[PDB]
Amino acid sequence: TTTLAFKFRHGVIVAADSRATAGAYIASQTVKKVIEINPYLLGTMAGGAADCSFWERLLARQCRIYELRNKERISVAAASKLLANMVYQYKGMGLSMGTMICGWDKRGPGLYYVDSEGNRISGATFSVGSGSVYAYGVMDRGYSYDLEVEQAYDLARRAIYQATYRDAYSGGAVNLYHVREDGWIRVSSDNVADLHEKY
Amino acid sequence: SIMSYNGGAVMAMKGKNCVAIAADRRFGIQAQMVTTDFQKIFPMGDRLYIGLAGLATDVQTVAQRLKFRLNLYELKEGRQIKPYTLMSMVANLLYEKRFGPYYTEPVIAGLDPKTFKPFICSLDLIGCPMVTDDFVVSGTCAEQMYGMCESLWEPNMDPDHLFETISQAMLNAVDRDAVSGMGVIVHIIEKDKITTRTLKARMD
Amino acid sequence: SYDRAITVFSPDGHLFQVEYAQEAVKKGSTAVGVRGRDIVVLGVEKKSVAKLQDERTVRKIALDDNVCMAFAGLTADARIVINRARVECQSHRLTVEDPVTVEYITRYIASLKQRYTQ
Amino acid sequence: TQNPMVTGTSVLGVKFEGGVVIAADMLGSYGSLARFRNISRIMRVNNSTMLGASGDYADFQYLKQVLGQMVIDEELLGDGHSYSPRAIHSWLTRAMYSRRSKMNPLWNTMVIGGYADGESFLGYVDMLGVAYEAPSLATGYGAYLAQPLLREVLEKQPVLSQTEARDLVERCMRVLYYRDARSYNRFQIATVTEKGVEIEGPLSTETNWDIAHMIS
Amino acid sequence: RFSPYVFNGGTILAIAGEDFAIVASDTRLSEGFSIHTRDSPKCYKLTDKTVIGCSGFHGDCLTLTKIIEARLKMYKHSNNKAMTTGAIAAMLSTILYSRRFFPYYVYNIIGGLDEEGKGAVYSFDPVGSYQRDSFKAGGSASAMLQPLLDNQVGFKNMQNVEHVPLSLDRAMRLVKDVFISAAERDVYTGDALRICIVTKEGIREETVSLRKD
Amino acid sequence: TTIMAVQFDGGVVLGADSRTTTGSYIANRVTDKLTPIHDRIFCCRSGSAADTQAVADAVTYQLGFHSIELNEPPLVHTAASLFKEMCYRYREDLMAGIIIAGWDPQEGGQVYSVPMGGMMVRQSFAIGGSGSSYIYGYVDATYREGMTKEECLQFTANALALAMERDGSSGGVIRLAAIAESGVERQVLLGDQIPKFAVATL
Amino acid sequence: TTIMAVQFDGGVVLGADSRTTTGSYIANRVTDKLTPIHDRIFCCRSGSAADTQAVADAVTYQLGFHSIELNEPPLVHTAASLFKEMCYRYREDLMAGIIIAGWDPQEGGQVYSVPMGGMMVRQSFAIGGSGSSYIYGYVDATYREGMTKEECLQFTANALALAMERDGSSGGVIRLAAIAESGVERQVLLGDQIPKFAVATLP
Amino acid sequence: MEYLIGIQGPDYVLVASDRVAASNIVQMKDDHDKMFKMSEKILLLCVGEAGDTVQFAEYIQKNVQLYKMRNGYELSPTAAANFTRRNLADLRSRTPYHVNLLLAGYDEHEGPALYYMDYLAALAKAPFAAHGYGAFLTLSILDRYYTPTISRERAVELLRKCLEELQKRFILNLPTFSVRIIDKNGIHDLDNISF
Amino acid sequence: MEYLIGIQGPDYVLVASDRVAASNIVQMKDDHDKMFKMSEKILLLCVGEAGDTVQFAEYIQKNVQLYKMRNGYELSPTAAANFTRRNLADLRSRTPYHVNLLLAGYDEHEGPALYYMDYLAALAKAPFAAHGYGAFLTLSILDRYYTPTISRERAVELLRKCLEELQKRFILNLPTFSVRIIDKNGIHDLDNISF
Amino acid sequence: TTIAGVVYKDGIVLGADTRATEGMVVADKNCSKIHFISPNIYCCGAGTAADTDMTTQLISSNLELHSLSTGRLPRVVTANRMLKQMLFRYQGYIGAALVLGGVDVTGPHLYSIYPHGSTDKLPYVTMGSGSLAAMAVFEDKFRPDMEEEEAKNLVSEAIAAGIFNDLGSGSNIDLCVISKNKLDFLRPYTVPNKKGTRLGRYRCEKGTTAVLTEKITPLE
């Protein structure tokens, strides 16, 4: 399990692998590790799968209620804070979550880290997961604010590739999403074994 | 588990007048991969290899003491070792540490140097000899390997199709194991030659 | 507790206590606010001026840093509604990390006046 | 309940052509002691359902109370409906599982037998709610010692006459008396057929100790 | 204090086809070293377009289906139609999650048709995450079936192979072969094989024996 | 597990059940629990199944070689002291309460209770095993000083039958032994020959 | 701790020791262990010392008011069922095995063993306490169908004296009680009056 | 482990905090703000167990702002510090907050006020205070050079000596440091001290 | 925790090590040498549990010198690494040596040799290797940029990128880094890389 | 693990299964659990397979000493003493519970040896996980002084019931017949369980698996 996302000049690039494990046994290789919140927001999967999925689905319901009542879409700073207030109450009961909220609001790009430990921080770059430490090294050596879009695609896929290469627990398919001002669009979906031939 | 700290997975499979033995190449520490060219199958003769999975330090410890005893054997006797004798020697060597056991489950695959009958066997981590006529597997993804080899094995195969079934068994087994994989070597032991091959595998 | 129905329908569609609540509006102080395009200026009437008054405590005009409001009628009800609106505005500041819009707290006060008619 | 103290061992059961026969000893052990020697562990619920329970005995008497008051409150209406044994089995599955969900189980392992609409019913409920039917059932050490004889006879001959099933039960109870440490040579047999529920007992098994002369 | 789960074994198997869904299961029920019964099917027909597979603790396997059929008949009252396959999956995800902190130890695999006449297999965890797959093995013997289906359905690690679509006659033989392979090596799977094929005409059954030991 | 020895004039009467359980499954229901340490000296085995057979081979060895050298039938007190030394020397790795009974020409019929600890004490009767707790009160009430051989065989059979009735870890057949100057006379009470006590019915 | 009740024709005979220990120090050596729940119904207290008084006060409360309402002397089976219900309802926090004995005009002399669990079973004789293990085998051998009153009093005194001799947690005086239609006759056996069994001395 | 430091002067309080947010071997934020504005004359420095910190700080913050809305004036730093102490103390409950706190405030009538508080909610007013394992390395320098009449340039110099002690001796990588000062003119942001 | 890194080139090995010795919150030594010279063509890098490191390394070192005294020539790095592995594995005794090792050597038949070894004494020859929690942060960049034919200045640049990642992301203060290169002319010391 | 034995009129009949499991997976299908020890003494080994393997090597070796030394065929009680002394000396840490059956000059004997060194002499034994199911058949059907074929069918039926009613056993029935006048090691005797026929064929042709490197090493 390795997920990363980073802000830059033309929006947010979100990349994720697709391996879910059961101990040493690999259960699946087609896990959709970026959960689609709404036409403008994305959430991420690290740690516990259902713990991520239920709270982000209920957050999508919450922000749709807010769109119906307040007649406007939700900001990142409000929605991620509601996710933090949902997951803060159940500290210490055994929950496991690592998430990134990615959208486009009036502050521009949005990228906030919220977990089941309760942490809530901003930042320009992030990476969460078991093989996340390998993703930081490949990500930060090419990262700057002035990245071009396709070079950002190459940096995201290369960092997830090296993270999947070193981590035994990470793998699957490198899924790549791009949130822009007019909405999020799917970039590509690529197997690791094809990119080993490419790289 | 202590066996699964380094990962690892080795299997053998019997063919008509040939045996095949293949081991994974990942040397691991529980999550961190370190190298991808770890040697587990060692030659103990012209047509006799031994494969050791499990804790990768006990593979090298048992294999160095085994080569120490086997060289004294083959210098004192004046013949190459028959594989059943090598099975009894490795079971003796592991059982000498009964209550201090090495964490390796060796598999042995080779040919009798006179009759050229195919032989395969495996052991537990403390020295129970298990001579089977179809296949023996060893390592952290044992269920995947029995699942592949129970359906893919058929008796009396030529070395080409034996290579094909052991390659498909290894490659489909280790891609459902997190802590194994990262490349595989395949040794085909024939009467007149040894074929050493490495395969295209997933590197994640 | 006490759970009779006070506001009940009359023989022709007139919640009597809602009519009388608007009577209680009709004798309060008259208030105006006029919107300019970069200012909003409020004007409320005084009651019984009484030159011994300390003017500080009789002010009729901040729910937040950005919003104030005018009223008419029973003064204690008005102070109650302001103390409901202020705690709702600061809870909104707690949950969204943005100051309130005027529609949110106006809809909240508009529903608060109806929930106590039923 | 966290501690079973007064316990009952194996209860058998097998379907036969026209009904169900279940059996159980009459012992209530207290640890190793044979403390109570004349208790009945078989309940007659109505004219077409009987019930035998292994494990903790106080919880069996609680179920006797509740499931007797249920059929009495059914018979007070007098509309012509009676609980089919499948209904009592589903009720016990829900009661045992609902006690399990409160982390407060009823420490039993029960066998419901009955005969309704001409069809024999034989159903198992344990303290977790694992519930199924079978052509023959056995709880406790009967599941290892008397269950193999029942299924070995049932493989050759799936339809049993009444006396064949009764002797098969007696011959399994002899095995349990030879090889269970908590059993007792004083047992009951309850048989439900078209005519209703009978209980025969106390019975006894006749032993053979000719291997005692086979030491040297 | 009352160790509240017992692993009652069993494997289930579902394959989503082009216009069908096959669901298979063993019928052996176990408890450690014992065999309770040899005819206890794990495939439960929900509606005309969906059959569900159960594996895990058997008491929760009974309780959950007694919940699901009640929820189906509540839906058929309040909405005047039968549920779709995706609606059943989305319902059961909430039902499994609402027992978060005392989970149903059940691995659910929903097989059936969607509204467009294609096969859909929805395989769940005990805590309610779910995903759509083409094929899935679950329960006890999943590690012996899932690499072989990875070979034969996804066509991985094969060169020079035509990726033919999923026909019925090859898929049925695949289900029988993988269960013979599971019964040869896993102790928990055996004694029968109950196969439910969901097509547009209805649901039919085929029974094959396995190893008795 | 219920063993019992009773001293009478001219010898001792031993008794034992025949049920050896592992957990609550009867592993052997015809177990012989009287081990000849010499001709007329029997030891009884209650507690750990390994230790009471493992020490008894060493004591049989030492006592046989001692009897060969001293040119005599060996004493019962000697056979008790060879257990009192050894079961004390390994007492933390043994769980062994032995009841040694036998005869010697020098001091007659003798019953030595060696409880778990490696001490030694002669008693007029000794009961042991898991079931002895249920028949302490019987034998304190029934024992009269100087019973005959047949009276003692009926007393041992009754006291064993009560413990086999009440204790679930005891049962089977009653194996008796009457050790005297004339020799050892063993007998087995099976089925109807076991003394029967009617249940407290109604 | 050794309590015992024996059913005979026309009533029951109860018996109890009088030694209450905390650890291995005798805290009270004249303890009265027979509690009157009604006029002719006695319960016996073995196990946790608090519970067997605290439940018994509630059962005495319910049973007296029930007897006043029904205008009837209350049954022994009623007094056993009020324990079987309540000791079962709190069985995780009680350690209580009660032996209820008594008389009623409707069914005569009755002895109900309520073991630790909240069940109920009528027996011809019941023994309880820590010392009862040493006198199971005596009373299985000595009991005869239909003993008289004085034979029951001697049988209860002998069976208690054996357990007081063998069990270190039992001793003191033997407090008997014979409950019948004529009433309750209590008596105390002290010193020489306790039936004596000579030690198995060496000859 | 997170670091805090505050110095109370004659008519000012100088506080500083580390600007790092870490996750178990790596830092995930290098512009992390641990200073939350309570009102115009009061800051609360907040470190400790993650999640408890921000929830507790914002819950206190909206009640301070709510008091300002209800009354039209600010809490005194004594009143807000005792309020925060009371809310942290109500500890033995089902909601314990393992938070470590410094509060700096300026009052019209009492002047500059600095309050130390641990996760027990023991409230101690001090002329200077510091949290973290880095406090053990720099309260000695603060005991060495602090006088009650330190003017603010000697305060930034002594703070620079303290953060250079963090750079030289302390084992955790704490490279960038945010500093603010409070006096009668409100809150003032100063330039970040970097290494 | 201590950091090691080694890069094996076509005819050279570049190794580097952190120069810090710590104690529980503070560092006691900022010129700590973890590079122990075994002979003219072999270095042994030694980190791990304190006490076991210097004792194990010097006990190997006197036997590596002793073989040269008895024989008049050097151990090959294969033989010395297998000897070190045998003494570390000889584990299932009482005496634990919980040491993390790198052995770099140049043979005069095989060229440059780099050996990885954990506390289990699992011996794995690698083209590059690293110890510590910083290995989790830097081996990925090593997989990103390493080719088998890296010339030595590009190897200094790739090392410097890894050390800047230690400065940027890693939470322990690792400011100064010693580096040596082993060649056919013996051991070469380079300038300390500092931040 | 299901092994059994009976004492019949002319000797000992031993039986076994062949399924050996590790974890909860079948590891071996045709494992031989009837060990050779002497020409007359065979020793079924249950429990820890490697410990009973080296034990029935070592005691076999010591009996090969002793039969050559005395020049006579060894007794059962000799192997009994050696087993109980070694297994008591290791205090049961050898996890081997044995059935030591043989025929010597005093007729047949059947001993069951528990790992701590306690020995029982029995007319019939069952060991292993499926010991209770075969013990049921023995308590139902055993008689003293049975003939050869009745004893063979009895042990085979008991091993069959232990195969069908246990997960821990299966896939073959081995027997052994020991007497004064004959030794009949019937391996296997009956095969109650049979692999099903594979309906599909999965034979991968040459070139199906991609190859990266290849090395041909010729030999003589």
- Which chain B residue has the Cα nearest residue J195? B150
Report CB contact under 8 Å: F24, D141. Answer: yes
Interface chains of chain A (3 or more CB pairs under 8 Å): B, C, E, H, I
> Which among B150, B172, B175 has CB closest to E181?
B150
Find, among F165, F163, F89, the residue nearest to F131 by Cα. F163
Active site residues of A: 1
Going through chain A in order, the beta strands assigned E by DSSP cover: 2-8, 11-16, 20-22, 25-28, 34-38, 41-44, 98-105, 108-115, 120-122, 125-129, 173-180, 183-191
Angle at D48 between CA D43 and CA D51, to 5 degrees: 25
Q: State whether I169 and H133 contact (CB < 8 Å).
A: no
How many Å lie between the alpha carbon of A27 and the closest alpha carbon of chain I? 25
Residues facing residue G127 across a β-bridge: G4
Per the CATH hierarchy, to which homologous superfamily does domain J1-220 belong?
Aminohydrolase, N-terminal nucleophile (Ntn) domain (3.60.20.10)
**Is C98 in the A-facing interface, judged by CB distances under 8 Å?**
yes
Method: cryo-EM
Put simply, whether G133 touches D (Cβ < 8 Å) is yes
Closest chain F CA to residue D209 = F190
Report whether the peptide linkage leading into residue D202 is cis, meaning its omega lies within 30 degrees of zero. Answer: yes
Asked if B78 and B84 touch (Cβ cutoff 8 Å), the reply is no
Which residue, chain included where needed, has tokens 């006590």? F197
Chains A and F touch (3+ CB pairs under 8 A): no
Helices marked H in E111-161: 142-152
Cβ of residue B7 closer than 8 Å to a chain A Cβ: yes
Q: How far is J143 from chain D (nearest CA, A)?
A: 8
Number of structural domains, chain G? 1
Q: With beta carbons less than 8 A apart as the criterion, state whether H130 and H5 touch.
A: yes
User: F160-197 as b/e, with b when 16 or more CB fall inside 10 Å?
Assistant: bbbbbbbbbbbbbbbbbbbbbeeebeeebbbeeebeee
Domain locations in chain I?
1-195
Rg (CA), chain C: 17
- Residue A149, chain C, CB below 8 Å: the answer is no
Q: How far apart are the first and last CA of chain D?
A: 49
- Does the distance separating the beta carbons of E133 and A50 come in below 8 Å? no
Q: Do residue A121 and residue H52 have CB atoms under 8 angstroms apart?
A: no
Neighbours of chain B (3+ CB pairs under 8 A): A, E, I, J
What residues in G contact F140, CB-CB < 8 Å? 162, 165-166, 197, 200
- Give me the CATH code for the I1-195 domain, please: 3.60.20.10
CA angle at J46 for the pair J45 and J49, rounded to the nearest 5°: 80
CB pairs under 8 A between A and I: 40
The answer to whether the CB of B162 falls within 8 A of the CB of B13 is yes
Q: Is A88 on the interface with H (CB under 8 A)?
A: yes
Strand partners, E193: E208
CA distance J196 to B26: 36
Closest Cα in chain J to E159? J208
Which residues in chain A are contacts of I136 at CB distance < 8 A?
133-134
Q: Which residues of A are annotated as a binding site for bortezomib?
A: 49
Domains in chain A: boundaries: 1-199
User: CA B68 to CA F114: how far, in whole Å?
Assistant: 55
Q: Which of E58, E101, E106, E213 is the best mutation test for D, with the most CBs of D within 10 A?
A: E58
Contact J136 D171 (CB under 8 A): no
Region label for H139, one of left (φ > 0), alpha (ψ between -120 and 50) or beta (otherwise): alpha
D114 and D77 in contact (C-beta within 8 Å)? Answer: no
Return the HEC string of D62-128. HHHHHHHHHHHHHHCCCCCCCCCHHHHHHHHHHHHHHHHHCCCCCCEEEEEEEEECCEEEEEEEECC
Separation of alpha carbons B118 and G33, rounded Å: 83
Q: Would you put residue H186 in left (φ > 0), alpha (ψ -120 to 50) or beta? A: left
Mark yes or no for CB contact A78/C101 under 8 Å. no
- The 3-state DSSP class for residue D185 equals coil
CATH of A1-199, one of 3.40.50.2020, 3.40.250.10, 3.60.20.10, 3.10.110.10: 3.60.20.10
Neighbours of chain D (3+ CB pairs under 8 A): E, F, G, J
For residue I144, give Cα distances in angstroms to A104, H25, I152, I154, I166: 31, 21, 17, 13, 16
3-state secondary structure at position C7:
coil
User: Cβ of D129 and E1 within 8 Å?
Assistant: no
Label residue D201 left, alpha or beta by phi (over 0 means left) and psi (-120 to 50 means alpha).
Answer: left
Judged by 3 or more CB pairs under 8 A, whether C touches D is no
The whole-angstrom separation of Cα C80 and Cα C68 is 15
Q: Which residue matches tokens 């070792």?
A: B81
CB D83 within 8 A of CB D73: no
B31: exposed, middle or buried (Cβ count in 10 Å: 0-12, 13-18, 19+): middle
Residues of chain I positioned with their CB less than 8 A from the CB of H174: 173
Name the amino acid, one letter, at J32.
Answer: S
Q: Which residues of F touch D55 (CB under 8 A)?
A: none
| Residue numbers of the domain that contains F181 | 1-202
Chain I nearest-CA distance from H170, in A, is 5
Residue whose entry in the numeric block shows the structure tokens 């289900």: E175
Spell out the residues 6+ positions from residue H18 whose beta carbon is closer than 8 angstroms to its own.
H2, H3, H4, H32, H34, H132, H134, H174, H176, H177, H178
The catalytic site residues of D sit at 1
Nearest partner of F40 among F110, F137, F125, F94, judged by Cα? F110
Q: Cβ I136–A163 below 8 Å, yes or no? A: no
Do B184 and B23 form a contact (C-beta atoms < 8 A)? Answer: yes
| Token output for J138 | 């023995």
Q: Per-residue DSSP letters for C57-76?
A: GG-----SSS------S-HH
Give the number of other CB atoms < 10 A from CB of residue E206. Answer: 14
Annotated binding site of A: 49
User: CA of J93: which chain B residue's CA is closest?
Assistant: B99
Do B165 and E151 touch, CB atoms closer than 8 A? no
CATH superfamily of B1-204: Aminohydrolase, N-terminal nucleophile (Ntn) domain (3.60.20.10)
Report the CATH number of the D1-216 domain.
3.60.20.10
Q: Which two tokens stand for residue C8?
A: 């009940």
With CA atoms as reference, report the closest residue to F5 among F160, F193, F161.
F160
CA distance C36 to D72: 82
Instruction: List the catalytic residues of F.
Output: 1
Is B122 near chain A, with CB under 8 Å? no
- Residue in chain F closest to D26 (alpha carbons) equals F199
Distance (Å, rounded) from C-alpha F27 to C-alpha F41? 27
The DSSP letter of residue H77 is H
Instruction: Look at residue B46 and give its three-state secondary structure.
Output: coil
Cβ distance J120 to F28 less than 8 Å, yes or no, reads yes
* Count of residues making up chain F: 202
Domain ranges of chain D: 1-216
Between chain B and chain C, are at least 3 CB pairs below 8 A? no
CATH of the domain at F187: 3.60.20.10
3-state class of E179 per DSSP?
A: helix
Of E101, E131, E143, the CB nearest to A25: E143
Kindly identify which residue of chain C lies nearest to residue A84, measuring between CA atoms: C95
Residue J54 zone, left/alpha/beta (φ > 0; ψ -120 to 50; rest): alpha
**Domain ranges within chain J, ordered by starting residue:** 1-220
**Interface membership of B179 toward A (CB under 8 Å):** yes
Give the CB-side neighbour count of residue F79, counting CA atoms within 13 A: 32
CA gap H81, H6 in Å, rounded: 15
Residue C100: closest C-alpha in chain A: A70
Residue of I105, I130, I135, I101 whose CA lies nearest to I118: I101
Q: Report H helices in chain G.
A: 51-70, 76-89, 136-142, 149-166
Q: Report the distance separating Cα A49 and Cα J104, nearest Å.
A: 67
Distance from the I122 Cα atom to the nearest Cα atom in chain B, whole angstroms: 4
CATH ID of E1-213, from 3.30.470.20, 3.40.50.1370, 2.130.10.30, 3.60.20.10: 3.60.20.10
Can you name the residues that pair with I32 across neighbouring β-strands? Answer: none
Q: Cα(I110)–Cα(G184) distance, rounded to whole angstroms?
A: 108
Neighbours of E67 (CB within 10 A): 14
